[PDB]
């Protein structure tokens, strides 16, 4: 049971049950499903993303800063912060992407438009196609940096 990638897990050093997606790295308290079969994955998806780059990114530069110097660890902290802010309701994904994404797609509020498999880096692609419409990923690591991905179509 559960849709692709999803497993019921428990927090360590704690003990709360939650649900984790091994492909998108999403975590949530809510069971991800409440009978459709042979549905497979979509042939095309549209996504927005918020990218946080770090010193080890394939291109450690962005419209936000000539030279990205933050560490991968510091980038992950930022990503975790943005996810928390979006889930709390204090911020919205598009506003954060417009302001803080290291990708040039910040100018389109994070929107990358529609794409097919073979078009993006593997971890980004796998996460995007494993998201259902309206879902947000957890931290997704690629050679570019660390992404939060929102599937819009």
Find the radius of gyration of the CA atoms of the chain. 16
Among the listed residues 47, 48, 49, 101, the single catalytic one is 49
Catalytic (active site) residue 144: yes
Q: What are phi and psi of 138, to 5 degrees?
A: -85, -165
> Which of 48, 62, 101, 147 is the catalytic position?
147
Task: Kindly name the residue from 47, 48, 62, 103 that is annotated as catalytic.
Answer: 103
119 is catalytic: no
Known catalytic membership, residue 48? no
Output the DSSP codes for 40-80. ---S-EEEEEEEE--TTSSS---SS-SS----HHHHHHHHH
Specify whether 47 is catalytic: no
Q: Is 27 a catalytic residue?
A: no
DSSP string over 17-49: EEEEETTT--EESS-S-----S----S-EEEEE
Indicate which residues carry an active-site annotation.
49, 103, 121, 144, 147
């Amino acid at each position: 049971k559960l849709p692709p990638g999803w497993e019921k897990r428990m927090s360590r050093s704690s003990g709360r049950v939650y649900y984790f997606n091994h492909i998108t790295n999403a975590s949530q308290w809510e069971r991800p499903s409440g009978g459709k079969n042979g549905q497979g994955e979509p042939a095309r998806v549209r996504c927005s993303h918020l990218l946080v780059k770090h010193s080890q990114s394939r291109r450690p530069s962005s419209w936000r800063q000539e030279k990205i110097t933050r560490t991968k660890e510091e980038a992950l902290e930022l990503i975790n912060g943005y996810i928390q802010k979006i889930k709390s309701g204090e911020e919205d994904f598009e506003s954060l992407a417009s302001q803080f994404s290291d990708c040039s797609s910040a100018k389109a509020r994070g929107d990358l438009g529609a794409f097919s498999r073979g078009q993006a880096q593997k971890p980004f692609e796998d996460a995007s196609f494993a998201l259902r419409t309206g879902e947000m990923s957890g931290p997704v690591f690629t050679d570019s940096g660390i992404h939060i991905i929102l599937r819009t179509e």
